[PDB]
Design a protein around this nucleic acid. Structure first.
Ligand SMILES: [Mg+2]
Ligand SMILES: [Mg+2]
Lengths: 56, 216, 43, 193, 99, 136, 142
RNA sequence: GAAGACAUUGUCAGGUGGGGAGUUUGGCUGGGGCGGCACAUCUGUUAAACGAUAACGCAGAUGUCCUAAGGGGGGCUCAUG
RNA sequence: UUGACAUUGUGAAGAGACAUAGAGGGUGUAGAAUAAGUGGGAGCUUCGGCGCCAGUGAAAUACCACUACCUUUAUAGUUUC
RNA sequence: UUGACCUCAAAUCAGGUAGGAGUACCCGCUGAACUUAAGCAUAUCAAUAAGCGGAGGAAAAGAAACCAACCGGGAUUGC
């Protein structure tokens, strides 16, 4: 919402993915490889916390 | 400059009127400039740091320690300023409680060019954490002159908080001197600041045990 | 021949640049795999 | 291209200038036909003098205001002072200009006098009857010439009183130059409490 | 406004005796007549206000005549028309307050 | 809107100063082309004037006044029989109406030195080379 | 000036260039004749010093490429706090403007400062942006 | 029936755009190309004991450095053995 | 292709951002306590009490102000989504 | 039910009018490049050639929302 560029994404989702189901969305996202990227970012965040712990 | 000299003269006049006549205090009152900067980010933008030496001293009597060699300690006997030698620093033996006690004892430190290398090795990084780090002095220069200089130093460093404060001078000085010093300090601050006179959030003049007065 | 197609020409029969073409490409450029999300034979 | 010590020429002949070349071979024949047109017009308006009466009037700019010349037509104020209406003056052969004004009494008096002499000199025929034929002249401008006014007499007495006529011009230019700054200083002096 | 007689200065030019001619009727083209004043007042009563005039009324009520003149200068062509428009809208505010 | 340059696929075949296609503007007005189409529709009439009535994003709307030069009420009535003179055929096509003279620039003044008696007429007049019998 | 021009053939390996307004350091240079008659073209493969990205370019050999001024400077650490190093210059000058490194260099430097070595830091300046590249330990003057 | 003040349309503005347009792509040179710079300069020599004097002749150099390594004065004498 | 303005009217809700009027708020551990930070400060006192030396803690405490971040009400408010 | 009004039609209805030609000159639209710059892209050629629409014996313009700054001039056109 407040964060920039969210609105541009919203228009697209409404435009082409309105007639879709969650099962289809998950399958499509995996084929695209978008899902893997999200996972990698989450993993990095865990890594940052891990580094602090190791130092301690 | 958005701030005008006549407005500075006026605000200094009621400031000294309150400090001197109406409610006098036994301790000598230092005049403070408290600034806050606007539309600025400590994390991304460059962290400005700078220093200026005022002509008339703000704090004549503030405690200063001189880390020094044999020549520096022998000169410091003539200067009358407290000093501990390299042997004394080795006798301290990196004990945190005593060096924290020294850091809260002395506001300012002056060190020799030779020993400024191993001042971190004998003492550690808690001086940089406090923000009191020793200033270099050489054999050629006068120690008491640089004590007067450090006592007249004004430093602006960004750090993390977007608000700074310095001590312009005493209440007891003359009005034109106080006006000139506060004007040159504001000019030095905006010279260090990028996009000058527009990233100035607020400028506040105050005296010790005194109310705030707002200059823009 | 290179006058007739983007893929034409050369001393060997080869495409030259990548055959995946942008959706924002113009007429005369869209020759190949238009707006391909992925290529190749999946297993 | 550029060559020996010659002046820099600017000959504008880089268009198809030979498509637009007007050589006036018909100067003599055009003059002959112009005289033929004047004669047939005079025969067509056989008593009337081939041109209207024009006023005397002062030429506009500072280069030419020393001279006086002919105008388009008389002012309505001038023809009312002459004592005839504008429509009647236009019918009896007086050019009337509705859009020039009278700001100069000498020019006004000269034009009124010129109208008085024209009304004295013309003969106006009755609209119906006898038509007493009267042997036209062809130029009202030649019968009423434009005369430059005599500005002064040719001999006078010297009247000198010590201003040299150069100090006067210089002081006038200086006070025009420093006019507005003096009222600015006067205004701030007045509003200085 | 008489001339000085010399060729330069403030009132340069030759002194000639003036005439002060009769005023032309075309010099009074923009003069307001009673009948057109009555017509303009009646059609203003009938038609009311345009949207930019309404938001100007709000700008004199809230943000003052300086912001009102800035917006009217952006809306109309020139600063002169903006000043006249803000003046007549202030007159409408005074008249409606009297109403 | 504008006048798109009618070239195939935007190719102009010339110097880059003439490569513009989109932002080019027609030199006559929409009022002028409106009354010219009305005159072509009724060629037996004569266009007198036109005025704006309405508009939207797509169209501009004009009303055109036309006078019949064969009707006896205009053959008589000397205030209007000047339109029956054959020099007034297609005034809107020659630019002789009010918006036609506005678009041609026909006005008195120093702001109209290029277009005062006709732009091409003045151009010929000041690009003519005048040679006399006795050369000056 | 901050940057100065140079010729492509005058450039050689382990030198700094400006590619797409980035300070880059060359790893590969290759020249191939354009046509038999024509001049050779220089292909340049370089690595950005700050970001580590690989940027390449092909130019005529006679063409002039922009070259930055890179200064490497030697300092001693004072403290590492909030991701900003505090350094100490010869003659006693101090700067805190340098941000700490974010990679394995930054991790190794953080562990070395935590376990208490005296660390010698090399920071480079090129085109108005500042970073730290390497650290050593002072073998003498302990 | 559907859709609905959103599309569409008009005008500006940013991006993309060899699909297309226009144009350019140095010189010297024991042919041109590659190489080099003899393309703006400086020292010695070729150079023929005034001056001038060529070659892609020979041996080299320049696109800097210096608040003193500038200016004035005083004292002293250097390399080497 | 993206944005603005016009075409373009009629109605309801819900969020967000500014102006200027005022309120309250900050708990790893250790430390007498709930430490948002800075900067001054050795005396301020209204209690003759609180700080200061001293304890602990990265950061120290009275007495002053400033600046963020939060929550918080209101305007014939200004507005955006 | 009848008679109006408004708007829109139909007639081999009564009477008219337009088209096409010519185009030297005239009034507009549209619109280049060769060339010159000793290269070339703005510029120039040129507000031209080619293309399109519309007149007359001339056309167009024309009786100031003008020029001026003077002691002011006074529709347009042409030299
Ligand atoms: Mg190929
Ligand atoms: Mg169009």
């Amino acid at each position: 919402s407040n964060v920039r560029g969210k609105r541009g994404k919203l228009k697209k989702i409404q435009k082409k993915y309105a007639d879709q189901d969650e099962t289809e969305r998950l399958l499509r996202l995996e084929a695209l490889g978008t899902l893997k990227g999200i996972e990698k970012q989450q993993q990095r965040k865990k890594e940052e916390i891990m580094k602090r712990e190791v130092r301690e | 400059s958005k701030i005008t000299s006549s407005q500075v003269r006026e605000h200094v006049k009621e400031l000294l009127k309150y400090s001197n006549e109406t409610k006098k205090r036994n301790f000598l009152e230092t005049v403070e400039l408290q600034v806050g900067l606007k539309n600025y980010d400590p994390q991304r933008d460059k962290r400005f740091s700078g220093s200026l030496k005022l002509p008339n001293c703000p704090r004549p009597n503030m405690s200063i320690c001189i880390f020094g060699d044999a020549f520096d300690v022998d000169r410091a006997k003539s200067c009358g300023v407290d000093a501990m030698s390299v042997d004394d620093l080795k006798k301290l033996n990196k004990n945190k409680k005593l060096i924290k006690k020294l850091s809260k004892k002395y506001n300012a430190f002056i060190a020799s060019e030779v020993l400024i290398k191993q001042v971190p090795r004998l003492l550690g990084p808690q001086l940089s954490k406090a923000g009191k780090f020793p200033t270099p002095v050489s054999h050629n220069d006068d120690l008491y002159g640089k004590v007067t200089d450090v006592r007249s130093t004004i430093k602006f460093q960004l750090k993390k908080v977007l608000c700074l404060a310095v001590a312009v001078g005493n209440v007891e000085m003359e009005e034109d001197v106080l006006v000139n010093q506060i004007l040159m300090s504001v000019n030095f601050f905006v010279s260090l600041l990028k996009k000058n006179w527009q990233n100035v959030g607020s400028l506040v003049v105050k005296s010790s045990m005194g109310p705030a007065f707002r200059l823009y | 021949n290179p006058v007739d197609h983007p893929h034409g020409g050369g001393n060997h029969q080869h495409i030259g640049k990548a055959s995946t073409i942008s959706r924002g490409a113009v007429s005369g450029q869209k020759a190949g795999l238009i707006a391909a999300r992925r290529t190749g034979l999946l297993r | 291209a550029i060559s020996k010590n010659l002046p820099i020429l600017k000959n504008h002949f880089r268009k198809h200038w030979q498509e637009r070349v007007k050589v006036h071979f018909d100067q003599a024949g055009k003059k002959v036909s112009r005289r033929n047109a004047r004669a047939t017009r005079a025969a067509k308006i056989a008593p009337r003098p081939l041109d209207l009466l024009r006023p005397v009037v002062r030429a506009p700019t500072v280069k030419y205001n020393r001279k006086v010349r002919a105008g388009r037509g008389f002012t309505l104020a001038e023809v009312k002072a002459a004592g005839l209406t504008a429509a009647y003056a236009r019918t009896i052969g007086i050019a009337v200009d509705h859009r020039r004004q009278n700001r100069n009494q000498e020019i006004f008096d000269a034009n009124v006098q010129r109208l008085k002499e024209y009304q004295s000199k013309i003969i106006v025929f009755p609209r119906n009857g006898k038509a007493p034929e009267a042997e036209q002249v062809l130029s009202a401008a030649a019968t009423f010439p434009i005369a430059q006014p005599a500005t002064d007499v040719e001999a006078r007495a010297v009247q000198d009183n010590g201003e040299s006529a150069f100090r006067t011009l210089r002081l006038a230019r200086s006070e025009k130059k420093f006019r507005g700054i003096r009222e600015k200083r006067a205004r701030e002096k007045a509003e200085a409490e | 406004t008489v001339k000085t007689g010399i060729a330069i200065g403030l009132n340069k030019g030759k002194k000639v005796t003036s005439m002060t001619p009769a005023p032309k009727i075309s010099y009074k083209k923009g003069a307001a007549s009673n009948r057109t004043k009555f017509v303009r007042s009646l059609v203003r009563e009938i038609a009311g206000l345009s949207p930019y005039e309404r938001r100007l009324i709000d700008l004199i009520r809230n943000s003052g005549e300086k912001r009102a003149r800035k917006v009217a200068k952006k809306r109309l062509g020139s600063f002169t028309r903006a000043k006249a428009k803000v003046e007549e809208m202030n007159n409408i505010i005074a008249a409606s307050r009297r109403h | 809107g504008n006048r798109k340059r009618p070239v195939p696929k935007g190719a102009t075949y010339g110097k880059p100063t003439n490569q513009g296609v989109n932002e080019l503007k027609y030199q006559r007005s929409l009022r002028a082309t409106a009354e010219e189409r009305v005159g072509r529709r009724a060629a037996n009439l004569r266009v007198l004037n036109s005025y704006w009535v309405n508009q939207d994003s797509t169209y501009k709307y004009f009303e055109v006044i036309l006078v019949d030069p064969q009707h006896k009420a205009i053959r008589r009535d000397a205030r209007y029989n000047w339109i029956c003179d054959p020099v007034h055929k297609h005034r809107e096509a020659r630019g002789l109406t009010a918006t036609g003279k506005k678009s041609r620039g026909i006005n008195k003044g120093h702001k109209f030195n290029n277009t005062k008696a006709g732009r091409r007429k003045t151009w010929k007049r000041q690009n003519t080379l005048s040679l006399w019998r006795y050369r000056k | 000036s901050a940057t100065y021009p140079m010729q492509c053939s005058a450039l050689r390996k382990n030198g700094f260039v400006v590619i797409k307004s980035r300070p880059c350091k060359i790893v590969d240079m290759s020249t191939s004749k354009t046509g038999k008659h024509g001049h050779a073209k220089v292909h340049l493969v370089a690595i950005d010093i700050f970001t580590g990205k690989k940027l390449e370019d092909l130019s005529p050999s006679t063409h002039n490429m922009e070259v930055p001024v890179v200064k490497r400077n030697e300092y001693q650490l004072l403290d590492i706090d909030d991701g900003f190093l505090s350094l100490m210059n010869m003659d006693g000058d101090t700067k805190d403007d340098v941000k700490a490194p974010e990679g394995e260099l930054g991790d190794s430097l953080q562990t070395a400062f935590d376990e208490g070595k005296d660390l010698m830091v090399t920071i480079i300046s090129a085109m108005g942006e500042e970073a730290a590249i390497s650290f050593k330990e002072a073998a003498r003057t302990d």
